[PDB]
């Protein structure tokens, strides 16, 4: 019974390995070897956002590519204009132990969460003129690590109880539970069509979930340690992960394989955040060595370095128009690069 | 503002008021003492909270000094992913029960509970996030130890112990083991107190330890220590 099922599971892992190997006719490095390189990517700090008095843990761009939201351990969630550096809102939190925040694509709401196991959703557009709590979503039994809005008045959250959840905000109840991880779920990323999403966890694995069905479509492995960050490739057919073993990896959803590894010999610090440029040719990654690296996504070369932060870089984002990159770190400053 | 419109100027004034409020809330926040509560199962943490799910935060005032005590014992997730959030706390209050020397864990009947307590203690002392964070060690339930020590020698948990099976020697032996688990002697200070469920001086002891920690921190900051 139990032995029979375990033996059948082993044969399935063997066939999946064989099915993947049979499709590895050539590597990506053997196809992109003749592409003209991106050269050297020079970027300079254009804006510095001051006002957080503690470590900054999360940051999210608005879909207008102008408004920012950032969360810090001083209990503050600040919304920034970032063109004039003016502060638009400063929301005090009922629990200062915030680790994640998100900005609604409509611009009407923001969400946050952390060690209180509750995802709080705030209404930014009220008649009283102030920002008030609209919902408190409870039901996770671990810390909330990442949350992202969908356009259907729904939100996807991940927590330290190894599960993911799809919540209906208006009702305040879970509509879907995604189970299958064997460790803390650290990162989520939504597909451009908001129909699939990927989650990366502390069991050195990432999973592709169907947000409408609740079932896991496929599982990707290859990292040697916990995955801290995950992001989709712009066309939705690939994604990249960052882990504690100082390596980035590019995975293909249709080939069901790892394509490229991004690492170097002098980098021994973990990766906290990863993002792609608008065209997907540049991969940006934040490290614990206080710097950020720009990699050639197709040639796996280091195209540039972003430096100027005095502590660990904890969050990174790129605007929808591709015009700028925002970084945040434990020195309580946000920086915008071009 | 010579290149701004009226609405841009008003937005800048709004930003300045937000700044002014943030600075005030920062100044109020910096005067509160942040204490992190760590203990093993059935270590008397409930009594320590009483005398002074997610995270639980307890607030109190003693001698016009505000304390904020954080209990993280309800979490069941990898500590290394969220323990760094508590870098910068004034002190870590660590609770160890003295009646656990001859008890074993329910999960593993062969694992002594007090050795797991020492494993947690030396995982917390020699971390990289708490290199300069002092530890206030409460050895609880001393009134339940002096009566049972006569029947259960320390050799059940400490086979290398030589001496008398009395409270006076055993308490000092356990205190020495816990204090010797530390390696950063010159930077980290452990304050050990022997208390019980009927004790009332725990608040004053915490106050004194926190006062000494703040004095040492200020001396180090002002370049005098």
């Amino acid at each position, epitope marked *: 019974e139990l032995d029979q099922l375990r033996q059948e599971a082993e044969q399935l892992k063997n066939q999946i390995r064989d099915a993947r190997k049979a499709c590895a006719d050539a590597t990506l490095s053997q196809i992109t070897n003749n592409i003209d390189p991106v050269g050297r990517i020079q970027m300079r700090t254009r804006r510095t956002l001051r006002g957080h008095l503690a470590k900054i843990y999360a940051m999210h761009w608005g879909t207008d590519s102008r408004l920012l939201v950032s969360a810090s351990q001083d209990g503050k969630l600040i919304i920034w204009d970032s063109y004039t550096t003016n502060k638009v809102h400063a929301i005090p939190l009922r629990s200062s132990w915030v680790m994640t925040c998100a900005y609604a694509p409509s611009g009407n709401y923001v969400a946050c969460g952390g060690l209180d196991n509750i995802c709080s959703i705030y209404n930014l557009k009220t008649r009283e*003129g102030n920002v008030r709590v609209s919902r408190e979503l409870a039901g996770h039994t671990g810390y909330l690590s990442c949350c992202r809005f969908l356009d259907d008045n729904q939100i996807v959250t991940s927590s330290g109880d190894t599960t993911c959840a799809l919540w209906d905000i208006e009702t305040g109840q879970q509509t879907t539970t995604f189970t299958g991880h064997t460790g803390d779920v650290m990162s989520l990323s939504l597909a451009p069509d908001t129909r699939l999403f990927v989650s990366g966890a502390c069991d050195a694995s990432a999973k592709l979930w169907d947000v409408r069905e609740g079932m896991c479509r496929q599982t990707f492995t290859g990292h040697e340690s916990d995955i801290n960050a995950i992001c989709f490739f712009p066309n939705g057919n690939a994604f990249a992960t960052g882990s504690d073993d100082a390596t980035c990896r590019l995975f293909d959803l249709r080939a069901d394989q790892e394509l490229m590894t991004y690492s170097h010999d002098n980098i021994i610090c973990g990766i906290t955040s990863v993002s792609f440029s608008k065209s997907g040719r540049l991969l940006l990654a934040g490290y614990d060595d206080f710097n950020c690296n720009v990699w050639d996504a197709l040639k796996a070369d280091r195209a540039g370095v972003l430096a100027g932060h005095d502590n660990r870089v904890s969050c990174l984002g790129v605007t929808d128009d591709g015009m700028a990159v925002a970084t945040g770190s434990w020195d309580s400053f946000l920086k915008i690069w071009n | 503002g010579c290149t701004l*419109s009226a609405e*841009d100027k*008003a937005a800048v004034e*709004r930003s300045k008021m937000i700044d002014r409020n943030l600075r005030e809330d920062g100044e109020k926040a910096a005067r509160e003492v942040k204490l992190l509560l760590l203990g093993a199962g059935e270590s008397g943490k409930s009594t320590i909270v009483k005398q002074m799910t997610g995270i639980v935060e307890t607030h109190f005032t003693f001698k016009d000094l505000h304390f904020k005590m954080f209990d993280v014992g309800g979490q069941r997730s990898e500590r290394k992913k969220w323990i760094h959030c508590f870098e910068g706390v004034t002190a870590i209050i660590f609770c160890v029960a003295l009646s656990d020397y001859d008890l074993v864990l329910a999960e593993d009947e062969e694992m002594n509970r007090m050795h797991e307590s020492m494993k947690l203690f030396d995982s917390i002392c020699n971390n990289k996030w708490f290199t300069d964070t002092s530890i206030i060690l409460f050895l609880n339930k001393k009134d339940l130890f002096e009566e049972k020590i006569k029947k259960s020698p320390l050799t059940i948990c400490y086979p290398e112990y030589a001496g008398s099976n009395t409270y006076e020697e055993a308490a000092a032996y356990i205190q020495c083991q816990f204090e010797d688990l530390n390696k950063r002697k010159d930077t980290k200070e452990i304050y050990t107190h022997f208390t019980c469920a009927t004790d009332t001086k725990n608040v004053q002891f915490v106050f004194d330890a926190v006062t000494d920690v703040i004095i040492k921190n200020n001396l180090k900051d002002c370049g005098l220590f």
Partner: single-chain antibody
Amino acid sequence: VQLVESGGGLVQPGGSRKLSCSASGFAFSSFGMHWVRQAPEKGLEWVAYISSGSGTIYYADTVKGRFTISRDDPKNTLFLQMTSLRSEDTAMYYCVRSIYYYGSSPFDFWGQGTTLTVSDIVMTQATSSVPVTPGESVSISCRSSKSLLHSNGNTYLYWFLQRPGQSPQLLIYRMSNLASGVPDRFSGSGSGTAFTLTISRLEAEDVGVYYCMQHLEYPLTFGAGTKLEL
């Protein structure tokens, strides 16, 4: 969200009078406040502004030296002290709330108005009244003596509607943006010094006087007002 003005009545010429406004249902201290008065000629004149932090205060050049605007946040009260009252100060006085940040609506809610009786960028609306029938579209024009398009890309034009017996209501902010609660039948357009408000279909509740305002620089100036008459 309610604003109640009080303290009006008859005043002898050369006297003094305090008007007050009580706010309820919103964060009064986060809003700046305007006093805007309507003379019996039914034109709107901007009188005074005091910011949310009381650090910025502006007056119209007709009331400088005679009027004083003030706030008391803990009572949510706005005060206007008037001295040396003249026969030209007889008007309906409206209290207006205003909040300024990226994407905000600065003239959304108006008060009800208190009656006081005493014993620059020019906005032109050449058409004083338009004969209208329900179910038809209408176009109202407004022209500025100076371009309202700022180097930051924003054009500071506002469209308001005042129904008979009611306070003015905001319809469009910054030229093309529809105010909350306003049906999508209203649309704003224009460029430079030319502005147009179009209504695809009139209903019974679209009758009244439409005003255009500039908010590029102080003092704030209103148009003459175009009336729609059934």
